[PDB]
Design a binder for this molecule. Sequence first.
Ligand code: BCL
Ligand code: BCL
Ligand code: BCL
Ligand SMILES: COC(C)(C)C/C=C/C(C)=C/C=C/C(C)=C/C=C/C(C)=C/C=C\C=C(C)\C=C\C=C(C)\C=C\C=C(C)\C=C\CC(C)(C)OC
Ligand code: HEC
Ligand code: HEC
Ligand code: HEC
Ligand code: HEC
Ligand code: SF4
Lengths: 46, 97, 336, 65, 46, 46
Amino acid sequence: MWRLWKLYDPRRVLIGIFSWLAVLALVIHFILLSTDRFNWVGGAAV
Amino acid sequence: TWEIISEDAPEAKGIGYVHNQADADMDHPRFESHQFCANCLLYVPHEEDGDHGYCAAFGMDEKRLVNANGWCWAWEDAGDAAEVGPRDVPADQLRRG
Amino acid sequence: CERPPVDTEQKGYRGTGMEEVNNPRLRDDDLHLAPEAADPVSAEGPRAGEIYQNVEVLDDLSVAEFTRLMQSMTDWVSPDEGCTYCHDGNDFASEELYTYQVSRQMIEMNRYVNANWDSHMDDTGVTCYTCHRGENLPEESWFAEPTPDVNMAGLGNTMMQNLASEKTEYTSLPRNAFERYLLGHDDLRVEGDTILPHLDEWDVSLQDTEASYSLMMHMSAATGSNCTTCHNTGRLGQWDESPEEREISWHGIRMTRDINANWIEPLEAGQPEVRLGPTGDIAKVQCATCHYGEQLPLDGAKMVDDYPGLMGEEDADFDFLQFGDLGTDGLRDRNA
Amino acid sequence: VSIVIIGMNMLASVDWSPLEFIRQFFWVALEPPPPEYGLSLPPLNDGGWWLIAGFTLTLSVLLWF
Amino acid sequence: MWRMWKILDYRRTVVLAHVGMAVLALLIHFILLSTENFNWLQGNPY
Amino acid sequence: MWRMWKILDYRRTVVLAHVGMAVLALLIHFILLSTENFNWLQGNPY
Ligand code: BCL
Ligand code: BCL
Ligand code: BCL
Ligand SMILES: COC(C)(C)C/C=C/C(C)=C/C=C/C(C)=C/C=C/C(C)=C/C=C\C=C(C)\C=C\C=C(C)\C=C\C=C(C)\C=C\CC(C)(C)OC
Ligand code: HEC
Ligand code: HEC
Ligand code: HEC
Ligand code: HEC
Ligand code: SF4
């Protein structure tokens, strides 16, 4: 799988991964804040 | 004193008050073959009759007692009155407000 | 997204675009099913006011019809609770529970609207079930929008606007339309009745126009209607260009205002804290409290005639023009 | 300056919640003064911020001209 | 990980990191203002 | 079955596959978030 980087430019893969990870972590953190149970700063009870 | 109501009175005729569970409207929709006056939520036993008591459908009238083996389609389960109110209002706020 | 087929009806002249389009697959068909009326019990013998210790509203009913009414109301507002929803256990002469006082007001109101508001309800009338539909609470009530006493030097002052609200049918329109028109009696007219302006005689602001718009948003979705079923929107303020639905719903506004101002709000004092809205107010009636998204509540089923006791006496004081329209004799002091 | 005033007032109307800002993005607004003020200068939170945003927006479009 | 700068252009990465962290810091601070228990300017009980 | 890559361009097939599978996976995860019996954050009864 080392040959994967002879095909795909490392910078574009890493930028693509970083953009996906940033959007995904933001979306997961936001979804959690939207729920009553996992809003850690809303301070609700279970 | 405590006259017992007449089964042929219009108040009884209207609700089908029968002195005996047999001869009732057994083909009335609201009817289970376990409902008696003693089992009725609207029945308060009389202090010194032994067999009769007051009926809330008759305004708890002294001169309108009902036989404890009677029945009318106004019967409601004495299993009620255990819980009173909306069952989501706390008891603190239920009475008065 | 939706799809065809859609039910279509013509409300105005061909080519005016006055049509109702409905999705048959969006109707509940269970919420609007009228309960099967009980058999007519006898109306003989002594009245209820002579039998019962504590009866003030249903005095002129027979014992049989009184108990038939009591059982019907139990199915309508609290089937899963029983008679002890309003009555304190076995003491049926007791008025301790708030639901008992509220229900006593609800019978007086149900009798009042059924006897005086045929200008809106015609002959159908209403029943406890028209609003409750088998529930302790009507699913379709409203509370007053909170008034937060804005900073006057801060930021983000929505003037009851600029937020998506189910009250305004997901518009940014004013959210206090119910308070102004369904409880208060503020003017709904927005159109000048002249070709040329007279700004010192008619100067309705666009904010007032959007408030009347927001009430119209509700009155459309609350009865499964749209602006076209009561209006020719090309000529919005022309009554002779409007279907007879507009005249009927005119009384629906004043009847809802009558229900809220004279019958519902007096109950606010003795409600439990859990029941009240954010402002501390009682849940109030809107157009959907009876209609639930259909032009004819409960499919226009005439339930009143089956139950003696929900019909009152035609008041000599009733006007339907004494609710903020040339006079305020049918409204109490408070309103809102 | 105009966009900051509009944006901060928009954000303040949803209690500063960025999530609620996205949820209400199309619905929030900087509201004009209520009718009672006429053409006078109203307080900041009663259309004053709107009047400043309108003034700076007018200046920017005129300078852009 | 000094080799990371033979892949990612360091000048652009530094600028986009500052821009990105500006959005994230403003976003997190604003989220705390919106909560009741962490709006320091409002001063609600914890 | 290696001959598939003498037909398509493998480099763009993999990039297209990731984007398509991301969209589908978010589609399915969001759809379950909208259902009642499979909303794991809501935790309704099953
Ligand atoms: C998220 C995907 C990123 C992207 C990430 C990568 C990665 C990783 C690589 C490249 C590589 C390349 N990219 Mg690129 N690239 C994108 C889109 C493009 C577009 C375009 C206008 O759509 C063009 C002309 C290019 C051009 C190029 C070539 C220089 C190079 C080889 C072609 C290729 O593999 O295409 C593949 C790209 C497409 C065929 C376009 C895909 C369009 C997608 C469906 C829409 C945008 C995605 C968006 C962020 C989310 C989509 C959700 C919805 C489905 C829309 N990319 C988008 C912005 N790109 C390769 C390289 O470095 O060569 C040595 C490589 O390894
Ligand atoms: C009341 C205290 C608040 C709090 C208030 C603040 C405020 C205010 C700020 C931070 C900032 C930060 N907080 Mg904090 N923070 C809290 C709880 C947390 C928790 C946790 C699990 O509880 C974590 C992991 C963090 C982590 C962080 C860092 C990402 C950041 C500080 C820079 C750093 O040290 O890089 C260490 C981290 C790494 C080296 C890897 C992560 C860095 C990547 C690039 C960032 C991706 C974030 C991703 C999109 C997820 C964001 C989730 C948010 C809830 C939106 N906080 C609590 C809830 N936090 C600052 C910031 O936003 O910087 C821009 C900032 O201004
Ligand atoms: C509802 C019941 C369960 C649940 C049921 C299932 C079931 C069933 C499945 C998953 C699967 C997944 N679940 Mg789950 N899952 C739940 C809740 C979650 C939660 C959450 C916050 O609650 C998260 C984060 C996840 C996350 C995940 C992922 C790990 C996984 C989907 C992979 C995928 O998207 O393939 C799509 C492919 C991509 C997204 C690829 C894109 C990734 C990269 C980073 C894109 C970068 C672009 C790049 C530059 C392009 C070039 C790359 C070249 C190759 C070099 N689940 C709940 C609790 N979940 C699936 C799985 O296991 O897959 C292995 C699966 O079948
Ligand atoms: C918090 O936000 C940050 C800071 C992060 C940045 C984000 C900003 C955002 C998201 C801003 C969003 C802005 C949006 C979506 C704005 C939408 C604007 C729209 C749709 C405007 C549409 C119409 C508005 C009009 C036509 C406004 C007209 C107002 C006018 C012409 C005002 C004129 C006022 C004048 C000339 C003032 C006179 C003042 C004088 C001096 C005469 O008073 C005495
Ligand atoms: C619509 C105009 C209504 C009709 C007709 C009837 N009711 Fe009602 N009722 C209505 C509202 C808007 C409310 C307030 C609901 C809320 O959320 O607070 C009520 C309330 C009651 C209650 C109190 C319920 C509770 O607080 O738990 C009772 C007991 C009640 N209503 C009974 C009742 C009866 C018996 C009716 C027919 C005679 C009746 N209501 C009609 C709206 C309307
Ligand atoms: C019937 C249920 C209606 C529907 C649906 C809509 N409207 Fe209406 N509208 C209705 C009435 C009975 C009245 C008169 C109100 C009064 O008390 O005088 C109105 C009035 C308006 C007005 C005011 C016009 C004027 O008289 O100057 C406007 C601007 C208006 N309606 C708009 C409107 C829109 C846009 C609607 C669709 C969303 C709509 N109405 C629906 C009755 C009904
Ligand atoms: C319950 C007390 C109601 C309230 C509150 C409102 N409406 Fe009503 N409406 C109600 C009834 C019982 C009927 C008659 C049904 C029948 O079969 O005749 C109506 C009728 C209308 C109509 C006329 C429908 C038609 O003739 O086709 C309209 C347009 C209407 N209602 C609208 C309406 C609006 C806009 C209301 C809020 C302001 C409203 N109604 C309140 C019962 C009740
Ligand atoms: C709330 C909606 C009620 C339910 C459910 C039931 N009852 Fe009721 N009942 C209610 C009120 C408001 C009143 C007062 C009547 C009036 O006009 O003022 C009553 C009254 C009675 C009475 C009369 C008792 C007396 O005055 O001595 C009886 C006998 C009675 N109710 C019986 C009864 C039964 C058997 C019920 C269950 C099926 C029942 N009620 C439910 C309000 C409500
Ligand atoms: S209403 Fe109850 S107490 Fe009265 S006769 Fe019938 S069953 Fe007996």
